[PDB]
């Protein structure tokens, strides 16, 4: 490579060079819980 590494200065050129809520609750499951 003769030149420094560089990102594509014209990236636009590549375009041309290729083709609700589940309302159910379970109160028994909620009591199985310590505040």
């Amino acid at each position: 490579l003769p030149f420094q590494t560089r990102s594509n200065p014209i990236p636009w050129i590549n375009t041309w060079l290729v083709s609700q809520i589940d309302s159910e609750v379970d109160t028994d499951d909620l009591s199985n819980f310590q505040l």
């Binding site: 990102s7 200065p9 990236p11 609700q20 809520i21 589940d22 309302s23 159910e24 379970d26 505040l35």
Partner: protein, 736 residues
């Protein structure tokens, strides 16, 4: 067929259009950046040349063009568009790039009435030229595009009718430092003015919107949060309304407590009139909030609070829902529902909840906050009294109604009032916490007013600031940073004015501060931790212990210097009780990190010398102010590597700090399986935070069967938050 078109320069003159001027400006801004393209910016500008085109319209277009190229593949555009915008703001205010001398600028601005008159009285020309050497105008080259647009849109001193920008970014910083320490003795004044300038201009300390936009201007009001309590009388409602109008007009955001207002149908004056209800008064509060502040930096916003057991609670929960008629809708305010342990217990047991009007249950309202035992006594007794007007609802249905309106609107908030008082810096008997603020991070005592200037009422003010967790390299750096932040805010309380006498009463009596954190998500990425898995639990405990310790130590040393705050005896600190004592003991099951700082020596030191400030720490969302340091706002995880945030001009693209190196360490908002990991971190933080935390809960409907979010999980998360002592719940974000 060359037409030879003309462009209009900034000074009105015209010359031949010369594209090399545009080339040079863009080449200047893209210098040192990676993966940017001058050509891309020019072609994507689609700039339409007409004879006589303003040169400012040309530049403002290429700013928008480079701003829209901010992407994951080309993140350095955040700096290209920022340099173009900083360059634009220099010309708008100075006519050139190089800013004038610090003294020359202050002289011109005070003459135009844009700066406060006192700056020239408290500082000499020799001191002004000496602060000019502190200024590093090249620090304007460290903002991102989102940061600069917030400066241009909100913070820099400007004309809201003309659009004329008056100052630079480094002038804002140096003058906020100058004004705050302007009352310090001259032997240490400029030492602080330099130190505080460096702290905020290198993004060690974050300053709120009213401080950034206000501290140097004639109008002195810089507390972000204003808490007003309303009593059950026309005199109190009138005073509350008048206080709101005053504080929306001066940069503030209100939390209103209208839970004391008696329910619809209650007798007025023995029975001479039918009580029209809460809604006609909430509507009066809404027009007060939106009355005048839409022309300033930001519009007025307020959150109104009421207990869950209020008789109208079913009518109040639906006030934001967009359906229904206007008579029973108050959409343009937010709401916080107040809940305690007894209310949650009725839900777990599947029992009922009895609804009362606060006027028909003597002593129940005050007990609802201060005395949890007295509440269960009075509540269960009043449930059996049949002469008292009541209405029973299934606790399951009432909780379902609240969470349904919380999920759809996202702005129905929760405040666990028992946690707000069992783990608070205040003695519930003397100064209970009965409400919160706009963003649910403030918890301060309040007492309603009988007139606009009622001396016996208390309006709670809170002044804010934040520590950039991404800018510190060692937790002990917080020691020096806490000293600088606390001193600047405590001096701000004596420096500013107060439009409502009752508000000055609380601010001078308690000197309540609310210092939080920003860049917490970026902080976890640097430590290779995540929100959801719980790998940040011990780190959060160690981090926020140091935050609270160095904040208390800073305010304790300041108490030795200038005396503790007048009403310090009303604090639990005065009794020798520390947050490390009153935190919820369930936190010991999600964090085994030991305390690493000498809290017992501070406890003795606080017993002896007190605290200059009644409160110190509060984790605010910092939606706007955190963008200045391009930080991830508050404790929230970023929505994406490039996040879209709102602004006056339009949408802003904000890149996460250190994206190229840490994009894998980040856990994005919707990359989280659930809320349990986040809510635990909020609980661990709350162990040390004086007030509260603007904690969000987030839900992705696609992560659930049938694409709908279950009410079961909304409640399980709400209960999980209470189990770990979370005081309040802010936004509920629902994806798409």
């Amino acid at each position: 067929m060359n037409q030879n078109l003309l462009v209009t320069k900034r000074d009105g003159s015209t010359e031949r259009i010369n594209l090399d001027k545009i080339h040079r400006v863009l080449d200047w801004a893209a210098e040192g950046l990676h993966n940017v393209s001058i050509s891309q910016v020019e072609l994507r500008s689609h700039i339409q040349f007409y004879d006589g085109i303003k040169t400012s319209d040309i530049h403002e277009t290429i700013i928008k063009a480079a701003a829209d190229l901010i992407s994951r593949d080309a993140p350095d555009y955040q700096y290209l568009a920022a340099r173009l915008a900083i360059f634009h703001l220099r010309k708008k205010a100075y006519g050139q790039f190089e800013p004038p001398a610090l003294y020359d600028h202050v002289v011109k601005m005070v003459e135009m009435g844009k700066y406060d008159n006192h700056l020239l009285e408290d500082y000499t020309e020799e001191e002004f030229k000496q602060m000019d050497t502190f200024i590093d105008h090249d620090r304007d080259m460290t903002f991102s595009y989102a940061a600069v647009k917030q400066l241009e849109g909100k913070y820099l001193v400007q004309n809201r009718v003309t659009g004329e920008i008056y100052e630079s970014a480094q002038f804002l910083y140096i003058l906020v430092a100058a004004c705050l320490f302007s009352n310090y003795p001259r032997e240490t004044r400029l030492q602080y003015v330099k130190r505080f300038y460096d702290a905020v201009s290198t993004f060690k300390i974050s300053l709120p919107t009213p401080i950034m936009s206000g501290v140097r201007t004639p109008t002195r009001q810089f507390s972000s949060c204003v808490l007003i309590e309303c009593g059950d009388s026309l005199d109190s409602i009138n005073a509350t309304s008048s206080a709101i109008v005053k504080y929306v007009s001066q940069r503030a955001g209100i939390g209103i407590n209208a839970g004391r207002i008696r329910a619809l149908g209650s007798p007025i004056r023995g029975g001479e009139a039918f009580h029209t209800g809460c809604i006609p008064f909430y509507k009066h509060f809404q027009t007060a909030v939106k009355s005048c502040s839409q022309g300033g930096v930001r519009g007025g916003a307020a959150t109104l609070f009421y207990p869950m057991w209020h008789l109208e609670v079913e009518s109040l929960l639906v006030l934001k829902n967009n359906r229904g008629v206007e008579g029973n809708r108050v959409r343009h305010m937010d709401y916080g529902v107040q809940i305690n342990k007894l209310m949650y217990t009725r839900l777990l047991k599947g029992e009922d909840i009895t609804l009362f009007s606060p006027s028909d249950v003597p002593g129940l309202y005050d007990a609802f906050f201060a005395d949890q035992e007295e509440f269960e006594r009075l509540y269960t007794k009043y449930e059996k009294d049949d002469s008292i007007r009541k209405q029973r609802v299934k606790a399951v249905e009432l909780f379902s109604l609240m969470m349904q309106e919380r999920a759809s609107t996202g702005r129905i908030y929760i405040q666990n009032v028992d946690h707000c008082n069992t783990h608070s810096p205040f003695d519930p008997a003397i100064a209970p916490v009965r409400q919160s603020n706009l963003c649910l991070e403030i918890a301060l005592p309040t007492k309603p007013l009988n007139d606009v200037n009622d001396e016996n009422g208390e309006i709670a003010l809170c002044t804010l600031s934040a520590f950039n967790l991404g800018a510190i390299n060692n937790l002990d750096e917080l020691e020096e940073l806490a000293i600088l932040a606390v001193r600047a805010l405590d001096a701000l309380l004596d420096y500013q004015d107060y439009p409502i006498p009752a508000a000055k009463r609380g601010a001078m009596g308690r000197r309540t501060l609310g210092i939080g954190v920003i860049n917490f998500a970026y902080y976890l990425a640097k430590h290779g931790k995540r929100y959801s898995d719980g790998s940040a639990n011990n780190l959060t405990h160690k981090t926020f212990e140091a935050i609270q310790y160095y904040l208390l130590k800073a305010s304790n040393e300041l108490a030795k210097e200038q005396g503790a705050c007048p009403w310090f005896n009303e604090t639990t600190y005065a009794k020798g009780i520390l947050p490390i004592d009153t935190y919820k003991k369930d936190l010991d099951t999600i964090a085994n990190e030991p305390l690493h700082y000498d809290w017992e020596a501070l406890r003795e030191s606080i017993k002896t010398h007190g605290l200059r400030n009644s409160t110190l720490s509060a984790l605010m969302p910092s939606e706007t102010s955190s963008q200045i340091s391009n930080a991830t706002n508050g404790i929230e995880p970023p929505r994406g590597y490039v996040s879209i945030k709102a602004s006056k001009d339009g949408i802003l693209r904000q890149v996460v700090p250190d994206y190229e190196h840490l994009h894998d360490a980040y856990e994005l908002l919707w990359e989280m399986p659930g809320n349990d990991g986040y809510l635990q971190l909020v609980g661990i933080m709350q162990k040390f935070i004086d007030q509260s935390i603007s904690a969000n809960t987030n839900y992705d409907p696609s992560r659930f069967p049938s694409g709908k979010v279950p009410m079961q999980q909304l409640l399980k998360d709400l209960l999980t938050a209470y189990k770990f002592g979370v005081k309040t719940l802010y936004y509920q974000n629902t994806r798409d």
